[PDB]
Amino acid sequence: GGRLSVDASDIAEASRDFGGVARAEPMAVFHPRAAGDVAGLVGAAFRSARGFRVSARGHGHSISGQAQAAGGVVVDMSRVARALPVHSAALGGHYVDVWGGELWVDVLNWTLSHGGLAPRSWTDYLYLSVGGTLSNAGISGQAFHHGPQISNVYELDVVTGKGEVVTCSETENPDLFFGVLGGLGQFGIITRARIALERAPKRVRWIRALYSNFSEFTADQERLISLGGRRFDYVEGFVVAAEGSVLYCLEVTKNYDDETAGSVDQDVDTLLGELNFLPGTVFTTDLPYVDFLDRVHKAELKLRAKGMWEVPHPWLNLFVPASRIADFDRGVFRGVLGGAGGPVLIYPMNKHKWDPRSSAVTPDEEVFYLVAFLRSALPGAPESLEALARQNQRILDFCAGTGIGAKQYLPGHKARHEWAEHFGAARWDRFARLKAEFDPRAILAAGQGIFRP
Numbered sequence: 019g020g021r022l023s024v025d026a027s028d029i030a031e032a033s034r035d036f037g038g039v040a041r042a043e044p045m046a047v048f049h050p051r052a053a054g055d056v057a058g059l060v061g062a063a064f065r066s067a068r069g070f071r072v073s074a075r076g077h078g079h080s081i082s083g084q085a086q087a088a089g090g091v092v093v094d095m096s097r098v099a100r101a102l103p104v105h106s107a108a109l110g111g112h113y114v115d116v117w118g119g120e121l122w123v124d125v126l127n128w129t130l131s132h133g134g135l136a137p138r139s140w141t142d143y144l145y146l147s148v149g150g151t152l153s154n155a156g157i158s159g160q161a162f163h164h165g166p167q168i169s170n171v172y173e174l175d176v177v178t179g180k181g182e183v184v185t186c187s188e189t190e191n192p193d194l195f196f197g198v199l200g201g202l203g204q205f206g207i208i209t210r211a212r213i214a215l216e217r218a219p220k221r222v223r224w225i226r227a228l229y230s231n232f233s234e235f236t237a238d239q240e241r242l243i244s245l246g247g248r249r250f251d252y253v254e255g256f257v258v259a260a261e262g263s264v265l266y267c268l269e270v271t272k273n274y275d276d277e278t279a280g281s282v283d284q285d286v287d288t289l290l291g292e293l294n295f296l297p298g299t300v301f302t303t304d305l306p307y308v309d310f311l312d313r314v315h316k317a318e319l320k321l322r323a324k325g326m327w328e329v330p331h332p333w334l335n336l337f338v339p340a341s342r343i344a345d346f347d348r349g350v351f352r353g354v355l356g357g358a359g360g361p362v363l364i365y366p367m368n369k370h371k372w373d374p375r376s377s378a379v380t381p382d383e384e385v386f387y388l389v390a391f392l393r394s395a396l397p398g399a400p401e402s403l404e405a406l407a408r409q410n411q412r413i414l415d416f417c418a419g420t421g422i423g424a425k426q427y428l429p430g431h432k433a434r435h436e437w438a439e440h441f442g443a444a445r446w447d448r449f450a451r452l453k454a455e456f457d458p459r460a461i462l463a464a465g466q467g468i469f470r471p
């Protein structure tokens with residue numbers, strides 16, 4: 019049903035990612051029409067004498083070649099008839115079946131136009147694939163309450179490293195289901211995901227407030243994620259330099275529709291009155307739900323206009339235990355980064371919203387932060403990338419040297435002992451046994467660099 023391509027433009031795209039450093043080239047790009055085509059190509063890789071590398075590519079947003087298949091085949095999962103959202107009296111809510119390669123922006127537009135429904139857990143940027151985010155976690159300001167996107171999926175169709183098509187969920191083949199979720203593409207290619215949906219809000223009251231005190235900023239973020247009961251629907255934060263001394267910006271939203279429109283003003287005021295931000299630093303925006311969710315695509319268009327999008331992105335994302343966040347500000351925000359461009363995001367989440375059976379690796383603490391260092395190197399300036407990479411290593415060295423039990427989100431580890439350390443003994447054993455069962459020849463997502471044939 020599908021086709022192998024050797025088009026130079028296809029080979030070039032499959033040989034690069036948003037990180038802009040890793041450049042491992044495949045022999046061909048596979049364009050599947052349906053799941054059976056993906057199964058055929060993986061089956062052929064498993065049956066071949068050589069056992070060539072096969073990796074699915076979502077939207078190519080990896081930082082360090084995780085979707086690259088050196089001298090093998092890259093499956094271009096990008097987009098056919100779409101399934102309509104479905105109501106279930108047994109689940110007590112809606113769901114939608116989507117193709118693994120579908121972009122979250124296309125999922126949103128589809129579900130809104132078919133019943134005004136939408137996923138309840140997001141990423142900040144919607145031009146990412148469903149299979150791509152579900153293989154990591156999929157995190158944004160809703161995760162503290164709904165959990166990440168891996169906690170908002172009922173079922174999957176997975177093409178294993180043996181080319182077998184398996185339907186899995188908590189009740190059917192749970193080992194494969196939980197293994198694949200946060201699994202870094204190690205156990206199969208997601209061809210279908212059954213996404214949980216809620217009736218979508220119509221509008222968003224988007225708030226930002228400034229802080230000069232890190233203890234008050236984090237104390238307010240930790241109180242907000244423990245609510246209610248009156249609560250915000252989104253809790254994020256970011257670090258700001260004195261020009262435009264360190265400032266911290268709290269970012270929150272209150273979702274509303276036609277029914278709740280008359281209570282949104284007082285709900286926001288009651289919640290904000292209980293906080294400790296700097297007086298006269300509250301900024302507010304009122305806009306449609308789709309416009310708020312697509313806010314990063316707008317930042318993207320302004321960057322493409324300045325030739326500042328197709329630059330190297332040495333991004334570093336860390337999960338930091340809440341017990342060590344104060345030390346982190348002193349040593350990193352004030353220390354390492356004290357004194358190319360890019361935001362530094364920071365906000366806490368609740369570990370109980372993360373299913374411990376999945377492959378995702380979080381710190382061993384109930385409340386932990388995501389600290390996202392989203393810095394870009396200067397265009398056509400290799401020394402800018404090098405200096406940023408040295409700063410990232412200084413951040414990891416700081417965590418190592420002070421015993422902060424941080425974990426990398428989207429891990430960029432190379433060595434086997436680095437992966438052993440990342441997972442820990444119990445999780446590593448579970449991970450390796452799943453690999454022996456579902457991808458014994460290490461064909462899938464070899465660009466992650468965890469296993470070898």
Ligand SMILES: *Cc1cc2c(cc1C)nc1c(=O)[nH]c(=O)nc-1n2C[C@H](O)[C@H](O)[C@H](O)COP(=O)(O)OP(=O)(O)OC[C@H]1O[C@@H](n2cnc3c(N)ncnc32)[C@H](O)[C@@H]1O
Nearest residue numbers: 076077078079080084118142143147149150156157203208
């Ligand atoms: C570039 C970027 C990334 C990003 C983001 C904003 C931008 C500009 N904002 C994020 C956010 O708010 N929250 C979050 O959790 N992540 C965010 N990211 C990172 C993003 O999630 C990752 O880059 C992730 O890899 C998804 O991106 P993408 O869809 O482009 O996938 P990929 O890079 O090609 O593949 C990543 C790994 O997954 C495997 N893969 C890909 N598709 C599948 C399927 N269908 N099944 C199984 N495995 C799959 C790849 O082989 C690779 O190992």
Ligand SMILES: O=C(Nc1cccc(OC(F)(F)F)c1)Nc1ccccc1CCO
Nearest residue numbers: 142143157158314317318335361363390392
């Ligand atoms: O990339 C983002 N968010 C984002 C927000 C505003 C501007 C952004 O910079 C960009 F260049 F416009 F993409 C990125 N988040 C992300 C990235 C990787 C891993 C996890 C996250 C979630 C942090 O909230």
